[PDB]
């Protein structure tokens, strides 16, 4: 669809399964090459990477933790020595876990804060480093969530990460936007996922949470992988700093359909 | 690019234009079937027909004041009764004019008012009550600014018209998600069209503006129409409610560049 | 409470009732001189200056259709004829009516743009005008409401009219930052006031707003008094151009406690 | 000024200097009884001590690091311990250093966010557990910045940090409003402190500062506690989960002045 991307280096954390999973697909399927990311073992890896053969991409697979700065550095260098560039770095890798916040322990805060936040951060300072030292005008693009805006009681550690990553975004895109460098944030509403599929799996808990989208159907990953192409692809030059949503109405208020209040 | 816009018909208002002509022409491109819009100087309309007949495609030109009830009643009605149906609405149309507050007239506020928000209003509800009673799951796109965030001084009825739309946009995508009708505001930075072809023809003045752009840049429209046809395209599934800002990072408070306060 | 209110002459829109009542009663235990507003016929008005003079204050009413622009110019003229100066005015006067909205007249739509966003302008404009011609460091408080971000189905003149608003007061406090005068909007969430009388009255539609609002309870008129008193004090000498929820958490998603979604 | 603050508990972390000093004063004032805190030097805490006294007020010293769970939970033990309860927790300490972000270390990163956010959140969450357990509707007060919405070149982790802060107490205000526990942001501009006594010192940096300041001038420490001691009160019952800005028109986009752009 983007001729742009035929050729481009593109970077995904935690791309082995879900959401960075079905992004890896799809810039395969532009014909860029990609660099996927496992944490323990290359299982998972490699049914993404033979997904990607299929469709005659061309990838490898890249062990590494986001929560260890070594990890990444030799994540983004493995892309350079494998293709010889990096255009894109997409910050995928997260996690939650609910606790009530008076309860939650430094432990469980700081798990969530030091991967989903910490190591965004990581991976766009290496990406950019790279961009700036090589005069390569790339991009980065972090993985957020609607809950960068959306409080979630339970979550305040998610929460927390989300906001500081937009806040983090907004500042590398002002920070960098004289080299070219375009920084946006992609926030998902509920999207069906491994993350969710025992949550989706119940009826109760599933028609909840249709209650809470608009459009009335929970998002595919196809759908988020939509936007991370555009985002990378040249059509979305003149785009940085962005967060854009893509959750069928979740941050408009479902509470306040019909009139109410 | 898109190959779900092929056959769908988009109607513009204030196309003969800037903004306007150019997301007429990207359209026509993309195969889809256009509606141009112009107030009064019928000249110009023609000269984007050429435009559109050169890369083959296929529209019609039809006048109308988006500040007359019955004009754009009739915009909507001629798309549908010469292509059959309408599938996008783009609310385009703008005016804008400096004074300061405290000595604006309401005749110069009523004016912008009327035509930057009441037109935009008028021509949504024309396109959702058709497509909420023929069952379509169509489209709107209204052209807001950066200005429905950022505030602008000797421009505030500008300023309130678009803080204005960003409510009626957000209002209307909730309001109508449970129908599949998606709409979507599109908020450009500085951009090189006619209103503003004196302003940047000045060096000093041109370089006041790209000073306050992150990106160093004065985007082009064709920059614009880019993000026009994507929201109007099947890939944006699932986005509703959002504010698309296209600016080079003019969001991001330029005068925070190098640390500095 | 704040004894730089003592002699301080206010102008309070739409005052004989709710909202604009309870503030005009609170300034006038500050020891702040009141200008009251009615609409049609003084009844309604002189409850509030019977209850103005129970507190010792000193008050006057004067009749004035905020859309009118004579009428608002002449409300700010008899405050400085009566009480020889204008220290702070409140542009509280509003109106709402439920519509679907690809259902609701121009006339509709009309009526609550030109009460809630135009009459605010015309009121802002006057007091501004007259703070700059004579060096006075004044203030202008906007009544907004939640729906200046929260989306309104059925409400969406309103929620385009405080959506509007916010965006006027931002541009007036930067317009008019270096002059010392400060412009702030009040985002009052759900309130025991005559607009919701009938609809709090019910048991099934008062459960269904306390159960939208986080704190659990409607708030009262003398909460939202409060937040005007201090606005408008010294005490908030650095705040300008923002918007002050009185909301009760209403704002910040009541749909996604207990870690929903 | 406000009368229900007497005999109120009030916590302030990193309270031996600046705004956290302004605020135990203004507290002690309220005849609150304050907790002041000093992570090393107590020399600067019994300055503060001493001027309390200067007001008649009382109160007591507690040594600790916000970054060092025990300490933390042993400040809000000696409030209790000492006066016998705790009714409002204000998370104050923070720290800031300059560095390009592609050249930032993991070590400057984790300092800002473990003593800005974390720091924050471990104060949050034990003035919150100590409410809960005792059915306390008490209020904890985060010291956040214009820097939560306004992106920072150079200071990406102490955006990210207050950006987290944002979203870390509206989470909490939703989580616990049904318990009658308020939790709000207070959003500081520039202010006179010794964070930027030698940035102000420098007559070029300090007229650099203030054209980025609407209103014109660098706000005093004493405008701050003032909006702390209004959330803390009664007037503010009805408020929650907030960022009161006090900046002076900073977030209002400075460089827009004069209709620029
Ligand atoms: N699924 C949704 O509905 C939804 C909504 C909003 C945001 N998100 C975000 O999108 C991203 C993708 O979520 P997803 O649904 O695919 O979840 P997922 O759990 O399937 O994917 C996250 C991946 O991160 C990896 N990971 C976790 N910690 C890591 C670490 N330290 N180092 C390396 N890899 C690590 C996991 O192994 C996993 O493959 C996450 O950041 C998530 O927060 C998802
Ligand atoms: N050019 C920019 O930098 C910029 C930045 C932000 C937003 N915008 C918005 O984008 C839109 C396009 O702006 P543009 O630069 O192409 O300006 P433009 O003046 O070239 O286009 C606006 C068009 O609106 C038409 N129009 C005005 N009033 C009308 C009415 N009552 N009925 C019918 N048509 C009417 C004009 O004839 C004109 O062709 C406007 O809404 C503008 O506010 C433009
Ligand atoms: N009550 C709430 O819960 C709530 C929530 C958010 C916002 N608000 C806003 O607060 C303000 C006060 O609302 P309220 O509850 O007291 O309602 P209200 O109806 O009691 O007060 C509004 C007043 O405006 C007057 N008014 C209307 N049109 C006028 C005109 N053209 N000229 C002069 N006066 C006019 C009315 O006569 C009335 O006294 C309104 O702007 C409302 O939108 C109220
Ligand atoms: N001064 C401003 O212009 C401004 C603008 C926005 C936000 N703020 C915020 O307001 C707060 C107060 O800033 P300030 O100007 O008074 O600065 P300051 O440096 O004078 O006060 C911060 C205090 O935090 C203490 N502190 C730092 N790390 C600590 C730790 N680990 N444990 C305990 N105490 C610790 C310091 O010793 C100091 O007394 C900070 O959170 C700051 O980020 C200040």
């Given at each position: 669809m983007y001729k742009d991307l035929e050729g481009k280096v593109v970077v995904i954390t935690?791309?082995?399964?879900?959401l960075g999973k079905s992004m890896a697909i799809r810039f395969a399927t532009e014909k860029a090459k990609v660099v996927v990311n496992y944490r323990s073992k290359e299982d998972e890896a490699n049914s993404v990477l033979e997904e990607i053969k299929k469709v005659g991409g061309e990838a490898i697979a890249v062990k590494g933790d986001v929560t260890v700065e070594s990890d990444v550095i030799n994540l983004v260098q493995s892309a350079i020595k494998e293709f010889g560039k990096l255009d894109v770095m997409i910050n995928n890798a997260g996690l939650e876990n609910p606790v009530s916040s008076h309860e939650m322990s430094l432990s469980d805060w700081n798990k969530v804060i030091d991967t989903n936040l910490t190591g965004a951060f990581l991976g766009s300072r290496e990406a950019i480093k790279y961009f700036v030292e090589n005069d390569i005008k790339g991009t980065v693009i972090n993985m957020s969530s609607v809950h960068e805006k959306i409080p979630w009681p339970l979550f305040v550690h998610y929460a927390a990460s989300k906001g500081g990553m937009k806040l983090m975004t907004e500042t590398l895109a002002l920070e960098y936007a004289p080299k070219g460098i375009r920084v946006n944030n992609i926030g998902p509403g509920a999207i069906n996922t491994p993350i969710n599929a025992e949550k989706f799996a119940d009826p109760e808990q599933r028609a909840d949470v249709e209650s809470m989208i608009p459009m009335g159907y929970i998002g595919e990953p196809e759908e988020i992988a939509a936007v991370a192409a555009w985002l990378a692809?040249?059509?979305?030059?003149?785009?940085?700093?962005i967060t854009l949503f893509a959750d069928g109405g979740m941050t408009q208020y479902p509470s306040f359909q019909a009139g109410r209040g």
């Open positions: 935690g791309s082995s399964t879900g692809s040249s059509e979305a030059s003149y785009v940085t700093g």
